[PDB]
Structure 1
Amino acid sequence: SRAEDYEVLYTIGTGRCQKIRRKSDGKILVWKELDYGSMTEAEKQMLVSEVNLLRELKHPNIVRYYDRIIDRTNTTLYIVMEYCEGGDLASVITKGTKERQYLDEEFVLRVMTQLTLALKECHRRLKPANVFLDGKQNVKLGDGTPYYMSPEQMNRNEKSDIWSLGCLLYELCALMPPFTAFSQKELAGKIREGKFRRIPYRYSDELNEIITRMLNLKDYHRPSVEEILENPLILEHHHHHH
């Protein structure tokens, strides 16, 4: 449980994230590096409590945080977590834009099912760059214009998460967010009228309908996590598999 127990293989992104290999058994992992050296004791107490709660989240659709390593020599904190070889959803969406190719409805149903179960777990106790893919088609929740801001949270709620999920699934389908604008104020205007284009016609009316419900202006009209999973679109094979 010290940094020397792992070899860095290479940097994923820049704190900073790195793909690492545990020496004892060759297990591929990643860590996130936080420099606390510029933090106060109150800020560091916050950081430790937060990290300790992250350690508790054990769920197949949430990024698993295994360990925390302190290198007081560097004043660097390392959060060691599972490696998701598939990258994040943001890159999937970008790939699709680039290669002019829409994502499979089956893939979208997998994201919808597994992300909804992730939220369900969070509520029991959201953007593409915060959604990760493993090697076996599993989706995991981890960790500028606020494209996904819900109407209500734009004024002063578990139904706000549903809205944000709706925006994410929408953008997975259309390869663009449901409400776009050049300024934030234009954005807010668009979000308030609550109008948007149908996802592309290659997607079934049933898929269109549930994404559209999640994007209702009134939070009480949005489906709950439980109503979402009850939908006939959502089958066993859309769930996680080891």
Structure 2
Amino acid sequence: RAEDYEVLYTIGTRCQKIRRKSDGKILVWKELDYGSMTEAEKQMLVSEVNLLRELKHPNIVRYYDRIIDRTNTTLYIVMEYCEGGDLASVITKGTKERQYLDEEFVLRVMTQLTLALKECHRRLKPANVFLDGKQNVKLGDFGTPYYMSPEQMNNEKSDIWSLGCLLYELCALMPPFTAFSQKELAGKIREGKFRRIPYRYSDELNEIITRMLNLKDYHRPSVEEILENPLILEHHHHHH
């Protein structure tokens, strides 16, 4: 079945951009080497991939297929290609070009990732968030821990904290809590103090990101409360 696809190139490490021969459809696959995975593990692997095969949602990276080649003892997980790359590169680009992201773009990310989470909760970091060709935002996969919530370090509201951190970093081009060591990082996170996002961003956007970064999980907004915010409009949602 791997022969049904042509590898175009390796995106990163392997994650490869591929083309399906039957119709030219562009995809990616992740090549997993199960050559050392014991018989006991391979069950934990199969169930994991089958639950990854559960989420059909426009803001979640879509799973298409799984391929085994016992030749190289290699499993290929085939999924949607996201042409716009990851948010980390967008943050990098902004930093290097000394240019803050548009509030409209930040609102799109907030809206569509909240909907992804809403779906995940029913059934998080910049390198795991992808853009497609039409501004749409996609959650994938669904060493200093910049986004670790205070309760996790001492819960659906923990995801809200993490979304708060990501949106903050999209606005400020830096995370809300920074430190040279983990113990210092933990100190800062527990104190819950951070600079306002840049002043080009509205008080309203600052307020919701700040609410997501409340020290108390029960004071952070739910996904439903986030989506009720008057900032969030139809054009911020996914569009085919």
| TM range, smaller chain | over 0.9
Q: Write the mapping of 1:135-174 to structure 2, written as runs, cut at 5 A.
A: 135-143=133-141, 144-155=143-154, 157-174=155-172
Separation in 2, partners of 1:72, 1:201: 56
How many Å apart are 1:213 and its aligned residue? 0.1
How many Å apart are 1:42 and its aligned residue? 1.8
How many Å apart are 1:150 and its aligned residue? 0.3
3-state SS in 2 of match to 1:20: strand
Separation in 2, partners of 1:41, 1:90: 36
Separation in 2, partners of 1:44, 1:105: 45
Separation in 2, partners of 1:158, 1:96: 30
Q: Which runs of 5+ in 1 are unaligned?
A: none
3-state SS in 2 of match to 1:81: strand
How many Å apart are 1:178 and its aligned residue? 0.0
3-state SS in 1 of match to 2:57: coil
Q: Which runs of 5+ in 2 are unaligned?
A: none
Deviations for 1:185-204, whole angstroms, at most 9, x for unmatched residues? 00000000000000000100
Q: TM-score under structure 2 normalisation? A: 0.99
Deviations for 1:43-89, whole angstroms, at most 9, x for unmatched residues? 11111000001111100000001000001111111010111000000
Deviations for 1:140-169, whole angstroms, at most 9, x for unmatched residues? 0011000000000001x0000000000000
3-state SS in 1 of match to 2:158: helix
Separation in 2, partners of 1:30, 1:125: 24
Separation in 1, partners of 2:225, 2:40: 41
3-state SS in 2 of match to 1:195: coil
Q: CA RMSD in A?
A: 0.5
How many Å apart are 1:236 and its aligned residue? 0.3
3-state SS in 2 of match to 1:118: helix
Deviations for 1:6-51, whole angstroms, at most 9, x for unmatched residues? 000001001x101000001111111111111111112111110000
Separation in 1, partners of 2:21, 2:109: 33
- Which among 23, 26, 33 is matched to residue 24 of structure 2? 26
> After TM superposition, where is structure 1 displaced by more than 3 Å over at least 4 residues in a row?
none
Separation in 2, partners of 1:238, 1:40: 46
In percent, how many aligned pairs have the same letter?
100
How many Å apart are 1:232 and its aligned residue? 0.3
3-state SS in 2 of match to 1:153: helix
Separation in 2, partners of 1:21, 1:185: 46
3-state SS in 1 of match to 2:218: helix
Separation in 2, partners of 1:196, 1:186: 14
| Count, aligned residues | 239
3-state SS in 2 of match to 1:41: coil
Separation in 1, partners of 2:136, 2:75: 28
3-state SS in 1 of match to 2:40: helix
Separation in 2, partners of 1:40, 1:93: 40
Q: Write the mapping of 1:1-242 to structure 2, written as runs, cut at 5 A.
A: 2-14=1-13, 16-143=14-141, 144-155=143-154, 157-242=155-240
Separation in 2, partners of 1:9, 1:183: 40
How many Å apart are 1:125 and its aligned residue? 1.2
3-state SS in 1 of match to 2:195: coil
How many Å apart are 1:227 and its aligned residue? 0.1
Deviations for 1:81-129, whole angstroms, at most 9, x for unmatched residues? 1110000000000010000000000000000000000000010010000
Separation in 1, partners of 2:163, 2:41: 31
